[PDB]
Amino acid sequence: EYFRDEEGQDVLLFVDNIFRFTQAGSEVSALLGRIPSAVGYQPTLATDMGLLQERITTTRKGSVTSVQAVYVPADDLTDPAPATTFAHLDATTVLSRGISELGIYPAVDPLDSKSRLLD
Amino acid sequence: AGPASGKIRAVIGAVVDVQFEQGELPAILNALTIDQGNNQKLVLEVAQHLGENAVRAIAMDGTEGLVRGQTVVDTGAPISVPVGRGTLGRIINVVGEPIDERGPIECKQRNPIHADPPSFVEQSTEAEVLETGIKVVDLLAPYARGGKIGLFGGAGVGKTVFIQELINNIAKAHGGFSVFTGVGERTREGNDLYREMKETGVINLEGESKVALVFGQMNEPPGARARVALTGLTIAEYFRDEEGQDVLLFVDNIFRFTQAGSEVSALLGRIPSAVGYQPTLATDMGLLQERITTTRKGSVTSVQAVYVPADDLTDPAPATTFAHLDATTVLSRGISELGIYPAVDPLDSKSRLLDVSVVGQEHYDVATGVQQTLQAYKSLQDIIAILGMDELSEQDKLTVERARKIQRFLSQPFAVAEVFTGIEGKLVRLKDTIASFKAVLEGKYDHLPENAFYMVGGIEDVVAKAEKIAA
Amino acid sequence: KAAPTEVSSILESKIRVSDEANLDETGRVLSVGDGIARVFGLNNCQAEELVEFASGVKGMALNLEPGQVGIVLFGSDREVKEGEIVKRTGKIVDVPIGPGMLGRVVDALGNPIDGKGPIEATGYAIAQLKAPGILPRRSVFEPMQTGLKAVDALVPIGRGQRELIIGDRQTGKTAVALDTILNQKRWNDGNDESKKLYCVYVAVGQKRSTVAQLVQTLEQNDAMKYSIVVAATASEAAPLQYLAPFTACAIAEWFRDNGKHALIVYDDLSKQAVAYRQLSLLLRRPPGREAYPGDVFYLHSRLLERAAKMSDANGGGSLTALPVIETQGGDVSAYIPTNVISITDGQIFLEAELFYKGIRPAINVGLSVSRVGSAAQVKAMKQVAGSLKLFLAQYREVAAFAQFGSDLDASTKQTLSRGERLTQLLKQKQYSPQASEEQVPVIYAGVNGFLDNIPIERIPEFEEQFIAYLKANEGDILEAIRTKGELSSELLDKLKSATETFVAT
Amino acid sequence: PGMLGRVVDALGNPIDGKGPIEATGYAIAQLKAPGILPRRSVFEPMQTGLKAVDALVPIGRGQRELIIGDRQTGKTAVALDTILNQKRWNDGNDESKKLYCVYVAVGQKRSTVAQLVQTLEQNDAMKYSIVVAATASEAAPLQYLAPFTACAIAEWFRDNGKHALIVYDDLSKQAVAYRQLSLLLRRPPGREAYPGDVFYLHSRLLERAAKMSDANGGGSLTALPVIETQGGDVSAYIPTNVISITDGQIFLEAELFYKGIRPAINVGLSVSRVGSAAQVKAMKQVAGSLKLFLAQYREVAAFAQF
Amino acid sequence: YVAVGQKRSTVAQLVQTLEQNDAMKYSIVVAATASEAAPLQYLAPFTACAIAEWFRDNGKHALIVYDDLSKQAVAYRQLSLLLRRPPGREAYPGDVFYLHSRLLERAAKMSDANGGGSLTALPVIETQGGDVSAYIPTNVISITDGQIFLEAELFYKGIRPAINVGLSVSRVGSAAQVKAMKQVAGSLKLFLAQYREVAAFA
Amino acid sequence: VRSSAGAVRDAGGAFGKREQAEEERYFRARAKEQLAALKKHHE
Amino acid sequence: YASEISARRNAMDNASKNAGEMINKYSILYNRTRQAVITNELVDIITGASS
Numbered sequence A: 001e002y003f004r005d006e007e008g009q010d011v012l013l014f015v016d017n018i019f020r021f022t023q024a025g026s027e028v029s030a031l032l033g034r035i036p037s038a039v040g041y042q043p044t045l046a047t048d049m050g051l052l053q054e055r056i057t058t059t060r061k062g063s064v065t066s067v068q069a070v071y072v073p074a075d076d077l078t079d080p081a082p083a084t085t086f087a088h089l090d091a092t093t094v095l096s097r098g099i100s101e102l103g104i105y106p107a108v109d110p111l112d113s114k115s116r117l118l119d
Numbered sequence B: 001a002g003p004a005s006g007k008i009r010a011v012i013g014a015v016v017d018v019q020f021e022q023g024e025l026p027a028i029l030n031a032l033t034i035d036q037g038n039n040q041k042l043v044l045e046v047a048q049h050l051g052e053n054a055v056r057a058i059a060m061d062g063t064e065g066l067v068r069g070q071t072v073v074d075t076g077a078p079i080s081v082p083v084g085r086g087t088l089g090r091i092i093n094v095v096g097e098p099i100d101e102r103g104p105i106e107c108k109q110r111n112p113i114h115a116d117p118p119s120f121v122e123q124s125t126e127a128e129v130l131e132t133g134i135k136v137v138d139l140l141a142p143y144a145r146g147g148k149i150g151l152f153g154g155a156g157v158g159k160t161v162f163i164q165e166l167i168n169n170i171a172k173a174h175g176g177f178s179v180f181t182g183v184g185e186r187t188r189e190g191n192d193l194y195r196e197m198k199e200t201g202v203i204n205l206e207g208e209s210k211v212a213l214v215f216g217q218m219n220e221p222p223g224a225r226a227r228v229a230l231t232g233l234t235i236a237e238y239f240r241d242e243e244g245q246d247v248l249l250f251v252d253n254i255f256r257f258t259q260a261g262s263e264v265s266a267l268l269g270r271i272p273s274a275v276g277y278q279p280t281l282a283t284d285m286g287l288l289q290e291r292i293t294t295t296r297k298g299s300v301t302s303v304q305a306v307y308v309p310a311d312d313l314t315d316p317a318p319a320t321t322f323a324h325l326d327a328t329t330v331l332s333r334g335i336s337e338l339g340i341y342p343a344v345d346p347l348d349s350k351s352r353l354l355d356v357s358v359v360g361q362e363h364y365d366v367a368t369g370v371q372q373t374l375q376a377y378k379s380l381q382d383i384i385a386i387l388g389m390d391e392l393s394e395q396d397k398l399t400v401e402r403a404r405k406i407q408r409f410l411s412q413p414f415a416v417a418e419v420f421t422g423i424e425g426k427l428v429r430l431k432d433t434i435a436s437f438k439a440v441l442e443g444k445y446d447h448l449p450e451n452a453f454y455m456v457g458g459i460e461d462v463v464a465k466a467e468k469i470a471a
Numbered sequence C: 001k002a003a004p005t006e007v008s009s010i011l012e013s014k015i016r017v018s019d020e021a022n023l024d025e026t027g028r029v030l031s032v033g034d035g036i037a038r039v040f041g042l043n044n045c046q047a048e049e050l051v052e053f054a055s056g057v058k059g060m061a062l063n064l065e066p067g068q069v070g071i072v073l074f075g076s077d078r079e080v081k082e083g084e085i086v087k088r089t090g091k092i093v094d095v096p097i098g099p100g101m102l103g104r105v106v107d108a109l110g111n112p113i114d115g116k117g118p119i120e121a122t123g124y125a126i127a128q129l130k131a132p133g134i135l136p137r138r139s140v141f142e143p144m145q146t147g148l149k150a151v152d153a154l155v156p157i158g159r160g161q162r163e164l165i166i167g168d169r170q171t172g173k174t175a176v177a178l179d180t181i182l183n184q185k186r187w188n189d190g191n192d193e194s195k196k197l198y199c200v201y202v203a204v205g206q207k208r209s210t211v212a213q214l215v216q217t218l219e220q221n222d223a224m225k226y227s228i229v230v231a232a233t234a235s236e237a238a239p240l241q242y243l244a245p246f247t248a249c250a251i252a253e254w255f256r257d258n259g260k261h262a263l264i265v266y267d268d269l270s271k272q273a274v275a276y277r278q279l280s281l282l283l284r285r286p287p288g289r290e291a292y293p294g295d296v297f298y299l300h301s302r303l304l305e306r307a308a309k310m311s312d313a314n315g316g317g318s319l320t321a322l323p324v325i326e327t328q329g330g331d332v333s334a335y336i337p338t339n340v341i342s343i344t345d346g347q348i349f350l351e352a353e354l355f356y357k358g359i360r361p362a363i364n365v366g367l368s369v370s371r372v373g374s375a376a377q378v379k380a381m382k383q384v385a386g387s388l389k390l391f392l393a394q395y396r397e398v399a400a401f402a403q404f405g406s407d408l409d410a411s412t413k414q415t416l417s418r419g420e421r422l423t424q425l426l427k428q429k430q431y432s433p434q435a436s437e438e439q440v441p442v443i444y445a446g447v448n449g450f451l452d453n454i455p456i457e458r459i460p461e462f463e464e465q466f467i468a469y470l471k472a473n474e475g476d477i478l479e480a481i482r483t484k485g486e487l488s489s490e491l492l493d494k495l496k497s498a499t500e501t502f503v504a505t
Numbered sequence D: 001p002g003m004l005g006r007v008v009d010a011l012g013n014p015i016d017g018k019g020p021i022e023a024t025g026y027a028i029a030q031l032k033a034p035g036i037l038p039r040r041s042v043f044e045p046m047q048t049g050l051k052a053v054d055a056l057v058p059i060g061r062g063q064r065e066l067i068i069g070d071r072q073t074g075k076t077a078v079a080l081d082t083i084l085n086q087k088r089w090n091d092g093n094d095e096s097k098k099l100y101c102v103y104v105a106v107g108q109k110r111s112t113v114a115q116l117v118q119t120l121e122q123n124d125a126m127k128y129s130i131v132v133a134a135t136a137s138e139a140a141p142l143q144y145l146a147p148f149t150a151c152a153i154a155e156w157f158r159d160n161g162k163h164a165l166i167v168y169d170d171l172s173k174q175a176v177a178y179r180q181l182s183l184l185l186r187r188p189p190g191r192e193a194y195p196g197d198v199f200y201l202h203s204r205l206l207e208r209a210a211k212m213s214d215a216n217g218g219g220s221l222t223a224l225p226v227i228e229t230q231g232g233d234v235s236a237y238i239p240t241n242v243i244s245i246t247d248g249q250i251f252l253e254a255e256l257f258y259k260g261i262r263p264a265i266n267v268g269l270s271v272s273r274v275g276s277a278a279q280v281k282a283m284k285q286v287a288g289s290l291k292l293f294l295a296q297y298r299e300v301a302a303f304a305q306f
Numbered sequence E: 001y002v003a004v005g006q007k008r009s010t011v012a013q014l015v016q017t018l019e020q021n022d023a024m025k026y027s028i029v030v031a032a033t034a035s036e037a038a039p040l041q042y043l044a045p046f047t048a049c050a051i052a053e054w055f056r057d058n059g060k061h062a063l064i065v066y067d068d069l070s071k072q073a074v075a076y077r078q079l080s081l082l083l084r085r086p087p088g089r090e091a092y093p094g095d096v097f098y099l100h101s102r103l104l105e106r107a108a109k110m111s112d113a114n115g116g117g118s119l120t121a122l123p124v125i126e127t128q129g130g131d132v133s134a135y136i137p138t139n140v141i142s143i144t145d146g147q148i149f150l151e152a153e154l155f156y157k158g159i160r161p162a163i164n165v166g167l168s169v170s171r172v173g174s175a176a177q178v179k180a181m182k183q184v185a186g187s188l189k190l191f192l193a194q195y196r197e198v199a200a201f202a
Numbered sequence F: 001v002r003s004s005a006g007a008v009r010d011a012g013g014a015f016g017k018r019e020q021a022e023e024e025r026y027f028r029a030r031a032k033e034q035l036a037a038l039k040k041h042h043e
Numbered sequence G: 001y002a003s004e005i006s007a008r009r010n011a012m013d014n015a016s017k018n019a020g021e022m023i024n025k026y027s028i029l030y031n032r033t034r035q036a037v038i039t040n041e042l043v044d045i046i047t048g049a050s051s
Ligand SMILES: Nc1ncnc2c1ncn2[C@@H]1O[C@H](COP(=O)(O)OP(=O)(O)OP(=O)(O)O)[C@@H](O)[C@H]1O
Pocket: B322, B323, B351, B352, B354, B355, D070, D071, D072, D073, D074, D075, D076, D077, D078, D261, D262, D263, D264
């Protein structure tokens, strides 16, 4: 964020993985005295994930893109760690295992990868 | 004498807090006597100490009638029980008293129920097989001599009938003495087990007995059910260490020991674990299972029975006991409804004596061939429910008929289950069960029907049933 | 971070002189609400003792602390306030018993609720009593005739055993226990005390209209004169419904310890578990599984272990327990469902699929079983229906083959036709119990193949015509099966010849 | 090096009855793991002995291979065969080819620890293998600290110039001992009745077994944790935390063990994160063509009935 | 428009599109991002209803859009879980159904003696995989007079918007409609639901 | 991938009841032919 | 025989397509039941430890 506000450049942040940030926040909250939420998650799930995702936006001097790797829990997109991070994701780079060895470099799915800026 | 007298300060359920003096407080796992209105006493085992000259004790009986400020004397040691040859034939309780109305147990010594287990240097490994008499137990999961045996099963599958049928053909002809310690049983099961042993020569009231009876079903409170396993194991451990005899501990059921401690764990100040269990589940189950092993002084073949909660092997009381048992006889509820007596799983049951170096090269090939044919029939049965029998070829048609006859041949009629089946009891040896299973897998009994092997013995009973059914 | 007991009000009395009045036999109510009542004092009060307040409501001190005493009120807490006097009776939670309690609808404490004045009690027994030992118990050899044809031949119950009744709502749970009490009128109206069995209905958790409708049907059929009714509705306190199982067992134990037979019906077992967890949660106690107490399995196992058959040296009596388990959608793998099925000697599964089609009662032969076996049944019913347990399993597998398109199997045509007629003949109507002489003739004609040539719709008319012809023509064959209770060589030849000639009008 | 040949407990005391142990140092149990600058690539190959483990999921020195599976399906069978197969390199003179085993029996009974130690001594395999005895009959502090005490003794060989191989048997028993002591110390619980540091307790002990570079000594340490699953569910609470922190997992199903596969090792579920970089060049030529033929035959295995 | 639970970049882009089409001059915008506290997002529904109630009590119509209703339920449960309360279904307190029913009951139509105004409520429920039988899904459908189900299957095929005729209905929508559109669309709701079931089996 | 070794008969629904009835009907028809051929070969 | 084999291929494709839709609906119900079982079991241990 310092390169976009002081120097003015479109920086790209990578958080590998995105599922590790949500699980680390509930560990320190449960050991302090806070009660759990659904699926053993922390009560401030929407407040902890929104404080770090709102800072990587576009300002008057520059922008800050985010390319985190979201991991679904046990192949479930309706969980508390998958549905909370998908509300702030504008694009998606799904890399299925159908290509790879088929002859595509890289394995980019043209039908599974969707984005909200394709209008 | 300077007795440690205590005052009752709190009483909620089985937990009773006793307040004594400074310095004269009793230790943990100590029996505390209490004078009531009858001729008996109120035994109370000290669990933990809350502090301020007070310790929380767990009563082993009814807590009704205790007022605030009653006298609570301390015995100084733990729960003493009668050991030796005097306990054979009598019905002992959790505190070591007789409940058979046959006078007092004339014992010269009294050992405590709380004791440490054996060390790693005192352990003696073995690889001997024990013949039980069943066709499904002598071919699949063989029982080890001197090890822990677990009969896993649900409610109504056949857990109580499996321990009663094995004691009438192994414990009655063994050189050592038996130790039937029932924990968490029923009221009708205790009276039926004592009358059957007297008519067969296991418990003689006027002669000699070789079976220790330890009462303690679900009719008492939570303190007596949790201490029933420690009181029954103390009498069997003295016969294998001081006397040097192959004792046989029969626990029924083994799942009641873990469920009894979780009932009083909420009132003792402990947080609950998973599925409403206690946090010390792996510590309390390992302290009692390690003491019933085989050392250098003698062996101890424990034949306990585990009760699965509503047919679930992934529970915290069933999965924690599978690592401390050599032979596991898991039972399924689906095989009991089809007519298999008993419902012995040929694929879920495993044992450490099912190798080629213990049972031989001939017995190892028969066990692997029977398990491969039963496992392959499950995959072929799913295709017949959607496509039919037209998709099966010559090899698939012969494998389906051989798998049905092999499952009914391992189910033999027990001697204790003669009132529900109607036929007589049959007992097959270890050599006759291996010879009959190898001949059916080669193609020597392919022309016989499936009804000739159901509820039969060995190879001799299968040939006589086919000729009588065709006439 | 602090502690209770001495706080503000209770902390200003120990600094001067806290004496004068005695605090051992009586006590002051410091806090009360939601049934619980924290009484400050009562040093001489024992555990589970009957407490009497100043307003007239009874109490039971179950939680004794060091500064207070948690007592559970047996009624309404609207008249109990802070600072009320709570006297101690000096005894425990007892109830009335004796032979004079038959014919009046008592409550959970022994008080009469039917309006017949006082109860002629001959003794005073405690509610929390010890069960029988292994030396004072014998084998279940007596036969409990319930009246149903599908219960007396399959899972037969005896005097001293505990038979559960699992099932959903409106499936046949309460109807199975009511039919067994009315079927004992043939032995209780005579003079044989060894064959009579007194009923003991303990309606716990039911409504007000359900308890009044069941007592009115038994009085019109000459069955309420020897039956104890324990009224325990859900509109009372939590301590009255939870103690309904212990109070009803003490009254029925007086007849088994003298030389008579008793039959207790705990309807239902699911309502007793919810009442015990409500009083324990309000007394500041930790919960267990499914928001219940720690000793949930020990509360139901201790009350059912006392109903056992005594030996010959104890009097020769027995006590039958009929606990109904209310399931939710046929789920038997719950917490309160699996705990009661592993303590009783058998269970009667009542499915909701066969109850709506018309097969009343819906008793599954492949799920319900009896742990007593053939020893708890009569010799007459076991001879004519020896293969009744094996015919139900073979007919179930052959019935599913008709919906696949197979029309062959000439040898299986006799077994498939006999299985459909045997299930309709064993299904009886409500309040229509049969004796041992009428059920032995109906089971012999359906198992030997004599009912295979009749129609399926005429199965109801064939049962009434066969029983009427055997009472006016060959009356000697019906009286021999009830007095002797068995059938030898002469009885088997006379019963087979009369059934074959009666099929042709 | 004096602890090789004797069975020690959780605190370092010898329980085999062979006298004292000549200890050359004292290391703490809660030690820090290696950094990102003192670690190198996995180039050495770990000879396990199995034909289906040396060709498919080949493990290397410094990686963490999980041994998932159900009850009695090949959990401890793969770890016992890999330690006994190192007799061809430990009996020679090459110190870089040898690998000292470190079996840490945690949660097992007293009879299971005595049977495993007697089988290794008869085949000349107990002279260079550490045994950490930790039965379930002791307290909750001794069983929970069995993973940290066994990792500290095996780290002395990797920091000098030798190789080590730890076998935490089992990973499911270590998680139950840590949650029992935290529940009695007045602490808040979390998911599946566990503490807040459930994922950090297993990741800290598994990250210390890495492969060092040439500037640190050239040693490595292998971690073979066995995850005892319930009924084949690999996506549980303690099963998903050990598979995400390790660089590979070997699945073991109960259905393939009764058919004829010895041992039951699913090729479609087990994979290694190192690939062919930590294997021999002679075995890599035959494993390349066998991987494509095994994957195509598994998807077309349903046509075998017709 | 009451944007509760949305991101910071989504609230700024939606306000710029309405001002370019002459639609932001008579519309209230209640910004309530997820980066603030848990008390600001939970009180966004009650604060937006008080500003729109002034026009209905004087003689004007108002239209409130609570986007979204699923985001407001997660913010209220965070403050209740930290105050040591009892969690019921889906880790929610006992007053979860009373918070959404009290804020939606005020958006009603007044009579002629109160001014003649009305207030329309448009709550958006974010379902998790089409689960309409959830704890927060059944509480909003039992207090509102109709719903508009948006299936994700027809939205990816080109049918925008994916409005299911067999699931979405209106209670007071028949008498509160235009007479010209209802006469030309004779049996339009019944013919649309029967055509979807016949086309799926052919 | 997922375990399905005998999942049809372990469920107990419509597919589980039809699999047990089909195997019992085929075994009952084959038992009649084997019993009749064994009695004629012994005399 | 050719018409019966062609009709059997269309019935097998329709049965495989109908099984995929039922497996997708059962996976959504199993995912919601797995998350509700973890929340209900954790609420029972937190209620007993706080009383
Ligand atoms: N490849 C194999 N071939 C033959 N037998 C095997 C093989 N793998 C394992 N076994 C048998 O399985 C038994 C148990 O093996 P192992 O010790 O690996 O599992 P376990 O630790 O007993 O499992 P659990 O802890 O669930 O009881 C051994 O007695 C062994 O004989």
